[PDB]
DNA sequence: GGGGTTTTGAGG
DNA sequence: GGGGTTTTGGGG
DNA sequence: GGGGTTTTGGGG
């Protein structure tokens, strides 16, 4: 039994080809999470790991409406309750996004969240980046291994085996190693990208804009 | 400078004092706030190293050293227990019963590290020789001076350190927690275990397979750049770990930015006994092979003993730099780890062809013996950590006509169209090789632009 | 000090 | 000059 | 006081 709500949710998302409708329904309930940081990065925890929530322009306007005396960029060490949320996979540059791995990211799309101002939460272990967790990374790698292996078995065909005479009697034979390189898929670039999940799309606000919207 | 022994340093002077000591434990240097870094270590010497033995339990006694700095680069990185440290201008005080030396490196304090073994950890990793036995391999500030009179102190301390580590455990039982009782700890705890496997999870992270004396196996993540000294078969002491309640598939230890992985000097009695007592475990691997999806990595092969000391080369270097790098061009034999994405030919039955040594041609045995000597002509399409994100899969050959990799499958070549037993064993190997989290550790020899597997055998 | 950063959020 | 430190204004 | 530095006698 997975004690981390986030770990479980994101794991099922990946084990279900990024399809949020296939993830257990008994997991799409309101999320009460502790705010670890709010600026420059807004990170919330579930008691075990931290994740970065992506707020829609609608969600923030609704927030500022129901809670005029509350600035989001100042919710650090405070608790929030996300009543309406969704998850989706996105291709990113893990070299720049630390809340991602292997150029993949599972995003927590926030549509509506209430700030339970001054609610003291129970003591927990130090929160760790979910995209740095051994099992979770391995779950992502499983995801790509399945994508890759399917792509390869569709791309490579005909059994173009190196002629045995090339590796036999190779006394006066020289060759370039790159001759062993085989394209994995019909991808356009030098990066593998032949995945079946349909990359979710949804406009989200940059934590910097919400900072200016509350203090130019 | 006048050097004083740990047990004889004044607790009332409050004046800066200097000493040489042996480091038996330390945290990695870590950042506390926007302007401070700390490194806490435990030190011993001829006058302070063991508690009143009678009812003590041969427990190690020690002073503590806390070094403070404004920059990371200004604090010592202790990769190995047993080396020596020289400190200047430290103030001593009693902290909860024990002698605590404090030194603000950001002000007027300094340290210097000296190797107790021939080479320092970094030097052994790079296969370098030490300038001299009186040269510090690391130190604070821009300069370090060793006076003629110190040479005796340093030589004697080294002599003592070896006597100490070969005679006592140094890291006593009270200094760590048995892995099989790891889930009972409230917070963090130390470990002393043998490194059974170093799996390259990705471009920046190693996943260590630990086993300690209690026989429990745990995994933990080690950043390559932080702990470059991790090596299979070696015994380390892990400073500060915590049990992961969210890992359900495997037992995992979490480390922190201040945690540290520490090796022992050559004379260590504890490291010697553990390297022999703790034996490899494959229970985790065997169990995982029964599951459709294993979050535990499984190394399916073992290379001949004569190669166990050969350094590994990534596919990245083997296929993209082996024709442009001076060092890579000079070698014809290499060692490498990878996972198999596809195996050709598709029909396992054609893995074995008949070979004609005169015409150098192979053929299907579906027609039978009329093709010559039986041999394996298998083409593996593989990938690895260094080539994870690219759109390539690389070819690795198992062409045994000349003896290379003949016993890779532990199944002598044979007409797989007639020998059911052979075919079945190979078919099963096939599913294992292509299964997620299955990897191959192998030695390859470059021949006419291709790499053939040799001196490598499946151990499952 | 047996500890909690970040232009470093993949040494810190 | 400016830190850390305590010398709390002045050495070399 | 004493570093490293240049301020080369004096701030905080
Ligand atoms: Cl060649
Ligand atoms: Na002063
Ligand atoms: Na001064
Ligand atoms: Na001065
Ligand atoms: Na001066």
Per-residue tokens: B311: 């350094």
DSSP, collapsed to helix, strand or coil, labels residue A97 as coil
Q: Is residue A208 packed enough to be buried (19+ CB in 10 Å), middle (13-18) or exposed (0-12)?
A: exposed
Q: State how beta strands B110-114 and B84-95 pair.
A: antiparallel
Q: Is residue B131 packed enough to be buried (19+ CB in 10 Å), middle (13-18) or exposed (0-12)?
A: exposed
Final residue in a domain of this structure, among B291, B307, B330: B291
- Quick one: DSSP state of residue A36? E
Give the C-alpha separation, A111 to A58, whole Å. 7
B237 and B301 part of one domain: no
Q: Residue B35 CA to D10 C1' — how many Å?
A: 30
What are φ and ψ of residue A32, in 5° steps? -95, 115
Given an 8 Å threshold on Cβ–Cβ distance, is A162 in contact with B434?
no
Final residue in a domain of this structure, among B259, B291, B323: B291
Task: With CA atoms as reference, report the closest residue to A204 among A3, A70, A34, A60.
Answer: A60
Chain A contact for B339, CB < 8 A?
yes
| CA max distance for chain B | 95
Chain-centroid distance of CA B357 in Å reads: 44
Q: State how beta strands B37-44 and B63-69 pair.
A: antiparallel
Per-residue tokens: A55: 């707020």
Torsion B267-B269-B273-B278 (CA) sign:
negative
Contacts of A105 (CB under 8 A, 6+ apart): A89, A90, A91, A92, A94, A97, A99, A131
B216 and B318 part of one domain: no
Q: Resolution, in Å, please?
A: 2.5
Task: With CA atoms as reference, report the closest residue to B202 among A215, A137, A206, A180.
Answer: A137
Is the shortest CB-to-strand distance from B27 to strand C under 7 Å? Answer: yes
CB-CB neighbours of B46 under 10 Å: 16
Residue B352 pairs in a beta bridge with B376
Given an 8 Å threshold on Cβ–Cβ distance, is A164 in contact with B361?
yes
Q: State how beta strands B298-299 and B438-447 pair.
A: parallel
The structural domain count of chain B equals 3
Q: Residue B359 CA to C12 C1' — how many Å?
A: 62
Smallest CA–CA separation between A16 and chain B, in Å? 14
B281 and B296 part of one domain: no
Residue of A nearest to B359 (CA): A165
- Quick one: DSSP state of residue A121? P
Q: Do A48 and A125 touch, CB atoms closer than 8 A? A: yes
B170 and B69 part of one domain: yes
Method: X-ray
Residues of B in contact with A170 (CB under 8 A): 447-448
Chain-centroid distance of CA A95 in Å reads: 13
B314 and B283 part of one domain: no
Give the C-alpha separation, B351 to A72, whole Å. 63
Per-residue tokens: B251: 């037992």
Given an 8 Å threshold on Cβ–Cβ distance, is A161 in contact with B436?
no
* B147 CA to centre of ligand 1 in angstroms: 55
Task: With CA atoms as reference, report the closest residue to B116 among B20, B51, B1.
Answer: B20
Task: With CA atoms as reference, report the closest residue to A131 among A49, A8, A15.
Answer: A49
Peptide linkage before B283 cis (omega within 30 of 0): no
Q: Do B343 and B378 touch, CB atoms closer than 8 A? A: yes
* B305 CA to centre of ligand 1 in angstroms: 26
Residue of B nearest to A132 (CA): B221
Domain of residue B114: give its range. 2-175
Pick B392's closest partner by Cβ from A132, A161, A182: A182
Q: Is residue B230 packed enough to be buried (19+ CB in 10 Å), middle (13-18) or exposed (0-12)?
A: middle
Given an 8 Å threshold on Cβ–Cβ distance, is A135 in contact with B246?
yes
Q: Residue B235 CA to E7 C1' — how many Å?
A: 54
CATH number for the domain harbouring residue B234: 2.40.50.140
Residues of A in contact with B451 (CB under 8 A): 177, 180
B192 and B98 part of one domain: no
Residue of A nearest to B186 (CA): A125
* B108 CA to centre of ligand 4 in angstroms: 14
Q: Is residue B306 packed enough to be buried (19+ CB in 10 Å), middle (13-18) or exposed (0-12)?
A: exposed
Pick B246's closest partner by Cβ from A7, A148, A176: A7
Give the C-alpha separation, B240 to B253, whole Å. 10
B457 and B376 part of one domain: yes
B329 and B247 part of one domain: no
Q: Residue B104 CA to E12 C1' — how many Å?
A: 21
B382 and B449 part of one domain: yes
Final residue in a domain of this structure, among B256, B271, B291: B291
Give the C-alpha separation, B40 to B30, whole Å. 9
Q: After which residues does chain A have a break in its backbone, defined as C to next N over 2.5 Å?
A: none
Give the C-alpha separation, B357 to B362, whole Å. 9
Strands (E), chain A: 31-37, 43-45, 49-51, 53-55, 79-91, 104-115, 128-129, 181-183
Q: Which CATH class is domain A1-216?
A: mainly beta
SS3 of chain B: the string is CCECCHHHCCCCCCCCEEEEEEEEEECCCEECCCCCEEEEEEEEECCECCCCCCCCCCCCCCEEEEEEECCHHHCCCCCEECCEEEEEEEEEEEECCEEEEEEECCCCCEEEEECCCCCCHHHHHHCCCCCCCCCCCEECCCCCCCCCCHHHHHHHHHHHHHHHHHHCCCCCHHHCCCHHHHHHCCCCEEEEEEEEEEEECCCCEEEEEEEECCCCEEEEEEECCCCCCCCCCCEEEEEEEEECCCCCCCCEEEEEEEEEEEEECCCCHHHHHHHHHCCCCCHHHHHHCCCCCCCCCEECEEECHHHCCCCECCHHHHHHCCCCCHHHHCCCEEEEEEEEEEEECCCHHHCEEEEECCCCEEECCCCCCCCCEEEEEEEEEEECHHHCCECEEEEEEEECCCCCCCCCCCCCCCCCCCCHHHHHHHHHHHHHHHCCCEEEEEEEEEECCEEEEECEEECC
């Amino acid at each position: 039994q997975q004690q981390s709500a986030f770990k479980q949710l994101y794991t099922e998302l990946f084990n279900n080809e990024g399809d949020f409708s296939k993830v257990s329904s008994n997991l799409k309930k309101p999320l009460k999470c502790y705010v670890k940081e709010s600026y420059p990065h807004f990170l919330v925890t579930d008691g075990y790991f931290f994740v970065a929530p992506y707020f829609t322009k609608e969600a923030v306007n609704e927030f500022h409406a129901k809670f005029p005396n509350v600035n989001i960029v100042d919710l650090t060490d405070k608790v929030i309750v996300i009543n309406n949320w969704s998850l989706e996979l996105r291709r990113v540059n893990s070299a720049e996004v630390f809340t991602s791995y292997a150029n993949l990211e599972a995003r927590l799309i926030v549509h509506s969240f209430k700030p339970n101002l001054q609610e003291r939460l129970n003591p927990t272990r130090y929160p760790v980046n979910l995209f740095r967790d051994d099992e979770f990374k391995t779950t992502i790698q499983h995801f790509r291994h399945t994508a890759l292996q399917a792509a390869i078995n569709k791309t490579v065909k005909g059994d173009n085996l190196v002629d045995i005479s090339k590796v036999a009697d190779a006394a006066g034979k020289k060759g370039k190693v790159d001759a062993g390189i085989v394209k994995a898929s019909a991808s356009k670039g030098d990066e593998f990208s032949d995945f079946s999940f349909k990359e979710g799309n949804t406009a989200t606000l940059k934590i910097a804009d919400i900072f200016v919207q509350e203090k130019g | 400078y006048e050097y004083v022994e740990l047990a004889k340093a004044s607790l009332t002077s409050a004046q800066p004092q200097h000493f040489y000591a042996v480091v038996i434990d330390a945290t990695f240097p870590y950042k506390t706030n926007q302007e401070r870094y700390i490194c806490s270590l435990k030190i011993v010497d001829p006058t302070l190293y063991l508690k009143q033995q009678k009812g003590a339990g041969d427990a190690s006694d020690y002073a503590t050293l806390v070094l403070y700095a404004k920059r990371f680069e200004d604090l010592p990185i202790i990769h190995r227990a047993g080396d020596i440290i020289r400190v200047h201008r430290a103030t001593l005080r009693l902290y909860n019963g024990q002698r605590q030396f404090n030194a603000n490196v950001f002000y007027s304090s300094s340290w210097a590290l000296f190797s107790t073994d021939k080479r320092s950890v970094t030097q052994e990793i790079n296969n370098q020789d030490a300038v001299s036995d009186t040269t510090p391999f690391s130190f604070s500030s821009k300069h370090a001076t060793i006076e003629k009179n110190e040479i005796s102190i340093l030589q004697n301390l080294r002599k003592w350190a070896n006597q100490y580590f070969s005679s006592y455990s140094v890291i006593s039982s009270d200094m760590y927690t048995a892995l099989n009782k790891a889930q009972a700890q409230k917070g963090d705890f130390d470990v002393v275990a043998k490194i059974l496997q170093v799996h390259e999870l990705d471009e920046y992270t190693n996943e260590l397979k630990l086993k300690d004396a209690s026989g429990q196996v745990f995994y933990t993540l080690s950043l390559k750049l932080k702990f470059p000294h991790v090596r299979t078969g070696e015994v380390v002491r892990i400073r500060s770990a915590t049990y992961d309640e969210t890992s359900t598939q495997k037992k995992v230890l979490i480390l922190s930015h201040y945690s540290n992985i520490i090796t022992f000097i050559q004379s260590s009695k504890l490291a010697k006994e553990l390297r022999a007592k703790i034996q490899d475990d494959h229970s985790v691997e065997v169990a995982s092979l029964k599951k459709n999806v294993s979050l535990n990595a499984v190394v399916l092969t073992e290379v001949d003993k004569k190669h166990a000391a050969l350094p590994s080369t990534s596919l990245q270097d083997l296929f993209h730099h082996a024709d442009s790098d001076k060092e890579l061009q000079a070698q014809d034999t290499f060692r490498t780890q990878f996972y198999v994405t596809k195996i050709e030919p598709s029909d396992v039955k054609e893995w074995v062809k008949g070979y004609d040594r005169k015409t150098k041609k192979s053929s299907s045995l579906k027609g039978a013996s009329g093709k010559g000597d039986n041999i394996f002509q298998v083409q593996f399409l593989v990938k690895d950590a260094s080539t994870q994100l690219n759109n390539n899969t690389y070819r690795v050959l198992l062409y045994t006509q000349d003896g290379l990799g003949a016993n890779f499958f532990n199944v002598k070549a044979d007409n797989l169209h007639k020998n059911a037993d052979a075919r079945k064993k190979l078919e099963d190997s096939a599913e294992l090789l292509t299964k997620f989290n299955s990897y191959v550790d192998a030695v390859v020899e470059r021949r006419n632009g291709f790499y053939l597997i040799k001196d490598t055998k499946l151990i499952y």
